[PDB]
Design a protein around this nucleic acid. Structure first.
Lengths: 989, 212, 207
DNA sequence: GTTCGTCTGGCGTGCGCGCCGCTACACCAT
RNA sequence: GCGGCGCGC
DNA sequence: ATGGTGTAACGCCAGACGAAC
């Protein structure tokens, strides 16, 4: 039976173990044990905690006293108790008699000697002292040495870890020392917990008032530093006197940090406080989170984990460095585990009451300490800066800490030219740590979740730890490979984008415009004689100008941060450590600037390590340029290349004079990417040997409608496979145009039949009308939403008879659904099968769980306020999540098998990026793995899995029999031959 | 002039003679989870001061019958008074996201107008009033920009000061001041701004409307 | 049988009623009808356009108007109000949804004259949509005007079949002349009040 | 007290990330 | 936290 | 120039509730 107050006391004792304040824990424990009503609140874990403390300090007398309080509780000593006793005897070098009596008393209590080294939380110093104690009586006691790590024996992952085969794992372009220095820069950056970036907004304008404002803010910040230090020490004295009594308080938690770090943290939160205010509770959660985080940082700093991580990482870099070899070629995870690995652990977070109490304590202290005058131009009256307002934030009323308007105007006049980012928000300056477990990877000091469960859902992670380790190896390797991709900022593209950004902007090219370009209302109000309607007209006009101004401010700030990060990384090589969501798709961890971003974000990024073009590098760059322009989507590859050779002059002109030339790149679909590609091709053709030109630009190969490709592969649908380029074809097949044609022939049939709706739709059935619907069907579009999309595609035509929206949209959604029922019969059968299966499974009161063909467990988190499952989001969300897990598996297989060939691989879910020299290889792997994925009985393994998982509980037999009936009703596959995918040119193009 | 400001603050309009002839008032402030009132006489003596915390209102449903039950049980604990002053918030029929609050308050303000006006059916004299909250904030100088600040510090000063001889602004009975102080200290860790703003509203009502 | 009436009242308490007041209010007017246990319309009237719904929601004006309105009503065992289908999701109908609630608030507080002592509810909310379904006035889950049916109750006498409602001989002239004087104006409250009383007796008391 | 049936009403393309902001406007007076 | 937008698949 | 004050349309499933043994 755990209790809140018991949690507070236990956290107090453990925190006292952290602060080495043993007399404090002994005082509180003795006072609590001495009282009748307080002795009942104590637990064996607390006595074992103080016991372990005196064991670490070598206090035999105090440990015997604690043992007396254990037997007088009267509880019984367990594994941790005997571990503490043995540790104290070993550290104090006791005689072998007391240790022997300890082993015989332990044998009489029934405890095992190995269960102590397996079930007790002891550091390597504690383990070493306990081992030294056991070796005095039992010198031939050895822990089981486990060295070999098992290799994944999955069907699809067998060849990745099998030693049979010539591996050519790629190495970075950087030497060993340079990589070690990058590790030092990233380690320093994460130890600082803050990153300062120069703001790319406006140039060097010192001004007059800004200097005085900055001076005033500096003086006020020093005064607040002194006040916060004094109030912090006084608060520590008060909480210490509260510990002098038999009550728990947050004194040792305040004794966890260097105080100056606390004051700097509070001043940082005060500087970053928004002008409108924040929820007091959320502020408390932020202060507690940062306090705990900096506590973890200092703890790793002082416990030697950072130094051991240096010795580990520097030897890990031998595999990635260019001027270093390894004994045997292997994957990064394999070499990392072969080096040590200690892995260590992270301090388990405090209970929620401790966090809230500490956060509110620090916030209120910040309110009491910070003061300022009336400002302006010192003042006779002096007031605080932060105030409680008790306003309404989100429906429920909540207390909001609000800054004084003088402080807001002071910060706005100061115009601080620097921006602050979190260490985890910016790309890592060195290769990330390889993923070895769902709890250790990505950043070196900050922990990173393996799955992107929103808001700490806790559900998925335990199921990630439950499966055998090898089952995850595949994913754990893929996420490492994406992370080890070295990126760099394209200086030309950044210079142009900044030149546009700092002046007037260009929203046509995805460059947000400053508030100076916001639409102004012409002219100012002229009330009130006339007219009462003009007041509301100008009211709505002002509302529109304020709306446009606000949205422009949003894009301006977002692009300000993204472009500032790009500028800070201009002369640096950085890495993007990757992560997963609950379904399995990969995402970079730095969210601001990454290759999953917009057009501008992509153009700023290029591979840090280059690659010689070779025989077809330049040609693939030209095809890639035509693809980025989007001008030859329907044409085959040969006509794309010939088109590039045609507009070669406009390519070179666009590369030479981007903003002053013909501006041919500005007309492309992806303008900035086309511009960078134009620069790459321009440099390539002007070299003496184009075949040797080293290219850094990533080439994309994307799967057209990847979801329909995986559905058609699951159902072996012939027509559908032909539609999404699964069958080999000389020209790329458009599924949207085909659906439009099928709906057209249905329209002619119903037009001859006598239907009024089909007669008015003559000559209006186009691709754009059904594009959004057909595209969004894979995500669960129903007849209603598809009807709304068709409505949205019928109202803007203007050349269409009046409204007639109901008949045309209803008939058109029925004909699109029917057309997809003919082209994708097996697809709709599988979607309905998964939908019904999730309906029954979630109707039985259990969330939907499954396993990907690579061994990754996926769970859906949809619940309703244990918490009952939200069956609606389960049944509607199961199919799309399953398809997404499939394309994630395909992408990961492509990544691993490309790594076996030494290629640089990055991915945007279904867009596979590599060097121009290796595109032909990637497309050969991309198809191969795809054919190898759907060749396995995915639907059969899923059905049998759900039968063994949910049709096994003998409680209800009705739902076990109907559910076993539907799960075993797997739809029969079609006639399509999957091998044809290996010869499809436009499957990924 | 003064009458116009007295018309921005008090609604509905009450005769100034009858308003200045009050012997005791009850100042009521209600939120989404609590309601608090304070009974003060013309001698600025806090005859009573309490709140009915933890109710079954809000929480997604707006049942008029449950509102009648809760409000009736709440007014069953209130003594008789010459005038009942409520809090008039600055909520408007705009801000569509927070309309649930503006409805709730109105329901409260509706039934409180109907249940406390015990003699209105015969004489048509209002005994329930609406006092502007922002003006109460301006009176105590608790305004910062366009947002009212917490009046907790002013209540704490009124409660824990022994000097301040002559014009303490408020008086606490000896048989009840212990309960008031223990109540304040028991609610110091929680945000109970209705409890404070009710007493502040009573004092402001007496200083602005009764003893001008 | 309780899906329409809220709060829950013991069916015995409902079947022992001697007289009810059926109240239906709109945005500009309010109407009521007094019917006894013998289905005799003891009273049936409405107040001319009131001063509420004028852009502002002043509780003092609501108290004055509602008090003057209920001052003209006789004593009854139960007072039935309309519970509309307005939802808190229809931001366009927020002015209406507020108004009704204010009404429903004060009528609950002012008409429950004995609730402070015995705690027994005498003001109820009857589902309007169910009243529509009872008289088969539904067209696409939307209520139509029951004006023609009220006209039949007022002017058609012995329909060679049991009457559903009775009008006192000394008041039939006032009722029919009221109907014909208000036929050109939108007075759906006047009709839906009488229809609601009849529906209450047929559904709750004499099933 | 639990389970089953009915009805009424809400929903009707999925996940991943990022900005900003939470009575208003006009005029008169200092 | 909701709301206003924007972005990737 | 800045601040204050005055005025202005359908179908389907599911969650919940009530009745029945």
């Amino acid at each position: 039976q755990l209790s809140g107050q018991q949690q507070r006391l236990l956290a107090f004792f453990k925190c006292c173990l952290l602060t080495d304040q043993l007399p404090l824990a002994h005082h509180l424990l003795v006072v609590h044990h001495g009282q009748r009503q307080k002795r009942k609140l104590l637990t064996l874990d607390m006595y074992n905690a103080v016991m372990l403390g005196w064991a670490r300090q070598g206090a035999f007398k105090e440990l015997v006293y604690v043992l007396f309080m254990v037997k007088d509780a009267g509880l019984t000593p367990d594994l941790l108790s005997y571990a503490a006793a043995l540790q104290c005897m070993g550290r104090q070098d006791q005689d072998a008699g007391t240790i022997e009596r300890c082993l015989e008393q332990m044998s009489q209590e029934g405890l095992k000697l190995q269960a102590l080294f397996t079930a007790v939380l002891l550091s390597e110093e504690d383990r070493a002292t306990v081992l030294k104690a056991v070796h005095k009586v039992k010198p031939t006691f050895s822990l089981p040495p486990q060295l070999p790590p098992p290799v994944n024996t999955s069907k699809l992952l067998r060849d990745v870890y099998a030693k049979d085969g010539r591996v050519s794992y790629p190495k970075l372009h950087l030497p060993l020392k340079t990589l070690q220095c990058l590790f030092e820069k990233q380690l320093h950056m994460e130890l600082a917990s803050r990153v300062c970036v120069v703001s790319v907004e406006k140039p060097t304008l010192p001004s007059k008032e800004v200097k005085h404002a900055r001076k005033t803010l500096k003086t006020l910040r020093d005064q607040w530093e002194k006040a916060l230090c004094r109030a912090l020490r006084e608060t520590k004295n008060r909480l210490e006197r509260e510990v002098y009594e038999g009550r728990f308080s947050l004194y040792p938690f305040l004794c966890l940090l260097d105080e100056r770090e606390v004051v700097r943290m509070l001043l940082q939160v005060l500087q970053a406080l928004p002008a409108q205010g924040e929820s007091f509770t959320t502020l408390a959660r932020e202060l507690s989170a940062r306090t705990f985080s900096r506590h973890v940082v200092q703890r790793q700093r002082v416990s030697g984990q950072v130094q051991a991580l240096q010795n580990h990482y520097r030897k890990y870099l031998c595999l990635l460095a260019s001027d270093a070899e390894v004994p045997e070629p292997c994957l990064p995870r394999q070499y990392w585990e072969a080096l040590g690995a200690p892995e260590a652990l992270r301090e388990q977070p405090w209970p929620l009451p401790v966090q809230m109490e500490l956060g509110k304590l620090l916030a209120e202290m910040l309110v009491q300490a910070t003061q300022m005058p009336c400002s302006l131009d010192r003042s006779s009256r002096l007031v605080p800066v932060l105030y409680h307002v008790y306003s309404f934030r989100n429906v429920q009323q909540i207390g909001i800490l609000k800054p004084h308007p003088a402080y807001v105007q002071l910060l706005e006049k100061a115009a601080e030219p620097t921006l602050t980012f979190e260490a985890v928000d910016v790309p890592m300056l060195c290769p990330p740590l390889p993923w070895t477990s769902p709890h250790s990877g990505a950043f070196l000091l900050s922990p990173t979740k393996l799955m992107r469960t929103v808001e700490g859902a806790t559900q998925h992670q335990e199921l990630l730890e439950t499966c055998p380790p090898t089952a995850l190896h595949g994913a754990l390797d893929a996420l490492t490979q994406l992370g080890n991709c070295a990126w760099r900022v394209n200086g030309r593209v950044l210079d142009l984008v900044l030149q546009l950004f700092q002046a007037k902007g260009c929203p046509q090219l995805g460059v947000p415009a400053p508030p100076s370009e916001a639409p102004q209302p012409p002219e100012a109000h002229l009330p009130h004689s006339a007219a009462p309607a003009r007041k509301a007209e100008l009211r709505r006009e002002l509302a529109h100008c304020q709306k446009v101004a606000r949205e422009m401010h949003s894009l301006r700030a977002e692009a300000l941060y993204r472009l500032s990060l790009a500028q800070h990384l201009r002369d640096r090589v950085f890495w993007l450590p990757h992560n997963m969501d609950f379904r399995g798709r990969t995402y970079p961890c730095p969210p601001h600037f990454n290759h999953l971003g917009s057009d501008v974000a992509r153009a700023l990024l290029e591979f840090a390590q280059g690659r010689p073009l070779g025989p077809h590098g330049l040609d693939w760059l030209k095809i890639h340029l035509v693809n980025l322009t989007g001008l030859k989507k329907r044409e085959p590859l040969r006509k794309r290349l010939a088109f590039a050779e045609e507009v070669m002059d406009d390519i070179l002109d666009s590369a030479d004079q981007p903003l002053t030339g013909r501006k041919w790149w500005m007309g492309a679909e992806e303008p900035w990417q086309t511009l960078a590609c134009c620069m790459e091709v321009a440099n390539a053709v002007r070299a003496s040997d184009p075949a040797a030109y080293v290219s850094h630009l990533p080439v994309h190969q994307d799967g057209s409608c990847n979801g329909l490709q995986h559905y058609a592969a699951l159902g072996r649908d012939s027509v559908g496979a032909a539609s999404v380029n699964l069958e080999p074809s000389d020209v790329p097949q458009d599924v949207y145009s085909g659906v439009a044609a099928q709906v057209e022939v249905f329209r002619r049939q119903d037009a001859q039949r006598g239907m009024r709706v089909a007669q008015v739709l003559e000559g209006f059935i186009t691709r754009k009308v059904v594009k959004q619907t057909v595209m969004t069907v894979v995500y669960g579009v129903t007849r209603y939403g598809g009807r709304l999309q068709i409505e949205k595609r019928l109202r803007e035509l203007s050349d269409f008879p009046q409204e007639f929206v109901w008949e045309a949209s209803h008939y058109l959604v029925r004909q699109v659904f029917k057309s997809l029922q003919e082209m994708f019969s097996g697809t709709r059968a599988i979607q309905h099968w998964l939908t019904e299966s999730a309906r029954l499974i979630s109707h039985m009161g259990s969330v939907v769980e499954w396993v990907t063909p690579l061994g990754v467990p996926v769970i859906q988190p949809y619940r309703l306020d244990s918490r009952k499952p939200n069956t609606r989001k389960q049944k509607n969300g199961f199919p799309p999540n399953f398809i997404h897990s499939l394309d994630s598996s395909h992408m990961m297989l492509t990544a691993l098998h490309c790594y076996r060939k030494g290629l640089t691989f990055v991915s945007v879910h279904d867009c596979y990026w590599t060097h121009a020299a290796d595109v032909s290889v990637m497309n050969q792997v991309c198809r191969e793995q795809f054919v190898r994925l759907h060749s396995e009985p995915i639907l059969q393994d899923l059905s049998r899995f759900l039968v063994k998982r949910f049709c096994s509980e003998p409680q209800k037999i009705l739902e076990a029999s109907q559910l076993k009936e539907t799960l075993q009703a797997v739809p029969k596959p079609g006639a399509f031959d999957l091998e044809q995918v290996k010869r499809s040119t436009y499957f990924f193009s | 002039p003064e009458n116009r400001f007295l018309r921005k603050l008090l609604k509905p309009d009450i005769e100034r003679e009858r308003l200045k002839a009050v012997n005791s008032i009850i100042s009521i402030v209600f939120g989404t989870r609590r309601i608090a009132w304070a009974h003060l006489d013309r001698k600025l003596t806090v005859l009573d001061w309490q709140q009915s915390d933890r109710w079954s209102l809000m929480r997604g449903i707006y049942s008029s019958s449950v509102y009648l039950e809760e409000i009736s049980s709440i007014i069953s604990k209130m003594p008789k008074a010459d005038f009942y002053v409520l809090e008039k918030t600055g909520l408007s029929i705009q801000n569509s996201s927070l309309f649930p609050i503006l409805l709730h308050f109105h329901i409260m303000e509706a039934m409180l107008y109907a249940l406390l006006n015990k003699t209105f059916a015969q004489d048509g004299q209002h005994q329930v009033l609406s006092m502007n909250r922002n003006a109460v904030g301006k009176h105590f100088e608790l305004m910062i920009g366009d947002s009212r600040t917490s009046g907790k510090e002013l209540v704490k000063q009124f409660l824990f000061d022994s000097i301040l001889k002559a014009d303490p602004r408020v008086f606490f009975p000896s048989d009840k001041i212990v309960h008031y102080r223990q109540m304040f200290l028991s609610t110091e860790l929680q945000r109970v701004e209705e409890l404070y703003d009710s007493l502040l509203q009573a004092i402001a009502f007496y200083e602005l409307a009764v003893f001008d």
